[PDB]
Amino acid sequence: HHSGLVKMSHPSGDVEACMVQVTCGSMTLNGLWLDNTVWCPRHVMCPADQLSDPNYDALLISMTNHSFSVQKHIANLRVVGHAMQGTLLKLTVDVANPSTPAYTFTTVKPGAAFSVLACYNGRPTGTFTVVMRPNYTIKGSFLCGSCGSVGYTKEGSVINFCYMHQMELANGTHTGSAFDGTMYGAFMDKQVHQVQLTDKYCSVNVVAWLYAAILNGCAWFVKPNRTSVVSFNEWALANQFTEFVGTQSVDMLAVKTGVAIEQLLYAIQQLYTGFQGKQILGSTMLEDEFTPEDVNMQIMGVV
Amino acid sequence: HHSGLVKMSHPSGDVEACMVQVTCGSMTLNGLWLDNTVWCPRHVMCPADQLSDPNYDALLISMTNHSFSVQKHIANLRVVGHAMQGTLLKLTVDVANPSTPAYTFTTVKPGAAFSVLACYNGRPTGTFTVVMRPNYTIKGSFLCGSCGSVGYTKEGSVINFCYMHQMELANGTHTGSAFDGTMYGAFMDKQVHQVQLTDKYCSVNVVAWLYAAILNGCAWFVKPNRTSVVSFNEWALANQFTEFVGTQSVDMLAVKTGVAIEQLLYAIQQLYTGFQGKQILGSTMLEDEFTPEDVNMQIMGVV
Numbered sequence A, B: 001h002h003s004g005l006v007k008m009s010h011p012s013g014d015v016e017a018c019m020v021q022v023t024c025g026s027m028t029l030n031g032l033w034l035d036n037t038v039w040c041p042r043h044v045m046c047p048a049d050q051l052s053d054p055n056y057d058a059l060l061i062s063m064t065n066h067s068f069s070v071q072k073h074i075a076n077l078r079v080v081g082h083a084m085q086g087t088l089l090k091l092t093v094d095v096a097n098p099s100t101p102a103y104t105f106t107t108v109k110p111g112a113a114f115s116v117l118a119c120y121n122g123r124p125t126g127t128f129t130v131v132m133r134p135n136y137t138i139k140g141s142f143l144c145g146s147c148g149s150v151g152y153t154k155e156g157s158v159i160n161f162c163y164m165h166q167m168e169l170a171n172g173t174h175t176g177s178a179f180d181g182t183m184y185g186a187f188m189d190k191q192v193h194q195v196q197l198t199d200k201y202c203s204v205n206v207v208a209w210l211y212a213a214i215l216n217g218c219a220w221f222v223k224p225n226r227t228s229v230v231s232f233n234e235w236a237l238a239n240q241f242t243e244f245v246g247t248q249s250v251d252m253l254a255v256k257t258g259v260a261i262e263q264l265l266y267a268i269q270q271l272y273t274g275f276q277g278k279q280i281l282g283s284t285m286l287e288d289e290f291t292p293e294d295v296n297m298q299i300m301g302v303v
Ligand SMILES: *[C@H](O)[C@H](C[C@@H]1CCNC1=O)NC(=O)[C@H](CC(C)C)NC(=O)OC[C@@H]1CCC(=O)N1CCC1CCCCC1
Pocket: A029, A043, A051, A142, A143, A144, A145, A146, A147, A148, A166, A167, A168, A169, A170, A171, A174, A188, A189, A190, A191, A192, A193, A194
């Protein structure tokens, strides 16, 4: 029986209309064009021989407005100002994007999902959705030239930009910047080996997945036994789980199914020791890539 | 280690601009507006009391052009002609869609992937990618009102429309129509219980996934032992696998990794009996939802 759950991304058209190519000397990547501003990773200023130990402050001073080229491929924009904010460049152009959507900037938190528009040379090429891992990486699909690809969520008609792609880590995962210019996690935008924080199971997302299983008639793992939130969170710290924090979205699932959160916290502790040959929604391992919001929307039609 | 593989959909903007709402009496769903034509499922003509045993021929005769309303939400189109082709209606409107992309119509084959734009009331709400299963269903995410949502692939700038959503099966999976009006599989657009053909593992996609594992440095399952294509396909018929048919995309992966296809056919036969506690790209079961094309594009950057 299919759970009715897929990896669902927002329709990407609104963001496609904001994507541009930024070139600086021998370097090129993607930028995001909103109003009179173009955001892009600052290592577009770095020549290939200094990617390991860049001096971005000196690099920025060496630039003029004519050091940058901004092109929209799907118009050439004259750059009239340039500034650096953290790991991003803010270029000012003389044309406001006529397709600028209603938007804000936000930081995404571990366990939360967002949509990514992967672009190359200013051309959108694919879209997918990821969850911010507890170690502030994402399990993405990014190749050379993808930097400046953007991640976002959408509230109503308002796009909430939360990610701009910067780099691939040694374990194949990815990270980038929020639009305040801070890198997610402790990462730096330099091409050197960097310490990787341990990843964890996202407990709230595992709980959501188990509710999705109940909503599909799969509840063999549900017992009257209960583990309290405080008891589970002590257990989580010793077992590579995030501490559980309940939300209204989770409570809706408890109300719909009639299964208490603490019943699923107990089930998680037992299932972590092993599924014993049984499957939950086609899986023999805990799934934490679906949020409570995903389950409410895709299965219950609740937004 | 992350494989670098995600469920990747095409950017949906080109298709969002073609989506409309179609209303017929008390029924409403989505349509696809291309040139002067609007395609939509024919059961928009059915009142709720006849969804089990509809007479679409008599229903169509009872309609006039003014029986239909077509609205674009993200202009109201006057309907000037109506016709039925299989399980779809072809409405003719008096305005050509100014955002009509270059397009064709095609039928997708089992094992092949395509992008879906899920819409409600003519408003796109999400995008995801699915593989046509060997029993001509897809493992989608569709709720009431999603009918007329469209599936497509993209070759260059040309959109290849291949699916229009029609119904949910008893096991939670989904099916719909090609744009020649034929339903995928043996399914009928009536709200009755229908025979479900058995699903199968898509062997060519499993082979692609094992190549992706090798490309990520995971090759413990590779042995000098080989099973021929003809020998495997005899085995497949007795073990719920599709018969393997090689392609140029698969051959590229063999050339890149230096591992022969027949080596992976042997590995599949052994892995089908059990992973013996080991994992491949984070999984303890065979994965068939990634195509050879997905692996070539996402990992090797080859399109
Ligand atoms: C920008 O388009 C680019 C996106 C990358 C390319 C491959 N996949 C991506 O997501 N970003 C970069 O190339 C980064 C530029 C820096 C921040 C100045 N660097 C980066 O992503 O380096 C990836 C390399 C290659 C694999 C790996 O482990 N790794 C990490 C850096 C470091 C290099 C030296 C050896 C230890 C690891």
